Write a protein that binds this ligand. Structure first.
Ligand SMILES: Nc1ncnc2c1ncn2[C@@H]1O[C@H](COP(=O)(O)OC(=O)[C@H]2CSC(c3nc4ccc(N5CCCCCC5)cc4s3)=N2)[C@@H](O)[C@H]1O
Length: 431
């Protein structure tokens, strides 16, 4: 067991209750401080506060409950990153309805394939995705109700979130008396995510509650510090964006988003919103390695730049760190089947080329590619991980599940890795 790498102790113990209960508890607390910003849209410059966000999510929860949705139902949220995206997401977590994020700009075909797995009864969609959802509905009439996200009034005959809510709230509904549903966090699916044809990945509420431990951890996440703002350019419909944003909400952070990358807008949003931490996909890292405009901006509040979800070379990492006058790069590794990152750069413990260390509650090992036997330091082999954020299985695909997770609960990542003397993990790119 000398060669099984173990995750440290979480700074805070893992709270009880569902992921909806934990999100509801914390967002209510932030709702009660007027003017606490939850999301800022850098394109349209509008802020929405925790009070606005909490109340509309609670209203959506109760409206979905009075409509008839329960743990036997799934919704789809199909929308690019927006101020509205997490309203139906939170509302459905509050009542144990599973949420299937759909890749907003997917062509009709991949939308159909994602949604054929997830079998949603109600679809929330932004205006520019409506016609595709309509076409998917022709082939999957289990879709019985379509709700427009970025409207206040009805749009093209369909209810908005706001008119849908007032259609089903009881008289005298009180947003601050509402109690989120209580249920078995291990068996109630919180999210159905699309795999890297893609499979549906069922994630129980428990895996998000573990993520929330990491999110608030001073070592493996962000210190809950007032007036902390994040600038994230990560799609909400994949696991990297989904569970960093849910964690930032748990921490009461200001989540500044852009859904169309622009060099000047991004750098000016870093400066004007006094971003402390910036969240990029690795191909935008490759971009800012080439940028020669960073020195024009006041990035003194910038404490970290973070990457995940795809290979990042050590050289690109160091090049970006230099461009932004930072000691290094914060990084994380995970799979959709893993909920979120299970290898994370601890704060200030950064090492170039490394993806980080095993997170609290998890264990990781490297196994020989021919045998399966546990290798020691620096030996290269397959990365295997085990912990409470592993998915419960692929949706209606038990064989693909078992190919990936053996009877003892190790997940075979299909990646080549090694850990070093200080226990940092490196992912070896096959080519
Ligand atoms: N870091 C890294 N290097 C190289 N290859 C990597 C990689 N991460 C993933 N991969 C490759 O991607 C596939 C799996 O693809 P996927 O689409 O199934 O999913 C993901 O990559 C996705 C699931 S969640 C996730 C990450 N989640 C988080 C969460 C938090 C963080 N941070 C930021 C870092 C610093 C603060 C701590 C929190 C990061 C990430 S990433 N990615 C896999 O096979 C591998 O090949």
């Amino acid at each position: 067991a000398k060669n099984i790498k173990k995750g440290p102790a979480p700074f805070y113990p893992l709270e009880d209750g569902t992921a909806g209960e934990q999100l509801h508890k914390a967002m209510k607390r932030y709702a009660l401080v007027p003017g606490t910003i939850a999301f800022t849209d850098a394109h349209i410059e509008v802020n929405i506060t925790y009070a606005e966000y909490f109340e509309m999510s609670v209203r959506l929860a109760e409206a979905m409950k009075r409509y008839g949705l329960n743990t036997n139902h799934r919704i789809v949220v199909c929308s690019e990153n927006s101020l509205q995206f997490f309203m139906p997401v939170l509302g459905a977590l509050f009542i144990g309805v599973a949420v299937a994020p759909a890749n907003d700009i997917y062509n009709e075909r991949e939308l159909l394939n994602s949604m054929n797995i997830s079998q949603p009864t109600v679809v929330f969609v932004s205006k520019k995705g409506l016609q595709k959802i309509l076409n998917v509905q022709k082939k999957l009439p289990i879709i019985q109700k379509i709700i427009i996200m970025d409207s206040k009034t009805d749009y093209q005959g369909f209810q908005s979130m706001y008119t849908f809510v007032t259609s089903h709230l009881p008289p005298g509904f009180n947003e601050y008396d509402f109690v989120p549903e209580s249920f078995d966090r291990d068996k109630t699916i919180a999210l159905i995510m699309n795999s890297s044809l893609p499979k549906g990945v069922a994630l129980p509420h428990r895996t998000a509650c573990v993520r929330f431990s990491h999110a608030r951890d001073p070592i493996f996440g962000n210190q809950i510090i007032p007036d902390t703002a994040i600038l994230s350019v990560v799609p909400f419909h994949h696991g990297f964006g989904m569970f960093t944003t849910l964690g930032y909400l748990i921490c009461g952070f200001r989540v500044v988003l852009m859904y169309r990358f622009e060099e000047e807008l991004f750098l000016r949003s870093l400066q004007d919103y006094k971003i402390q931490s910036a969240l990029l996909v690795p191909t935008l890292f490759s971009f800012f390695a080439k940028s020669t405009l960073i020195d024009k901006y006041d990035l003194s509040n910038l404490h970290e730049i973070a990457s995940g979800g795809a290979p990042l070379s050590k050289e690109v990492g160091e090049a970006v760190a230099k461009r932004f006058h930072l000691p290094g790069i914060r990084q994380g590794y995970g799979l959709t089947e893993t909920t979120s990152a299970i290898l994370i750069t601890p704060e200030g413990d950064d090492k170039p080329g490394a993806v980080g260390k095993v997170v609290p509650f998890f264990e990781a090992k490297v196994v020989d590619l021919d045998t399966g036997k546990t290798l020691g330091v620096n030996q290269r082999g397959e990365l295997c991980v085990r912990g409470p954020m592993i998915m419960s299985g692929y949706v209606n695909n038990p064989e693909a599940t078992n190919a990936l997770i053996d009877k003892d609960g190790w997940l075979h990542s299909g990646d080549i890795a090694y850990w070093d003397e200080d226990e940092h993990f490196f992912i070896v790119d096959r080519l």
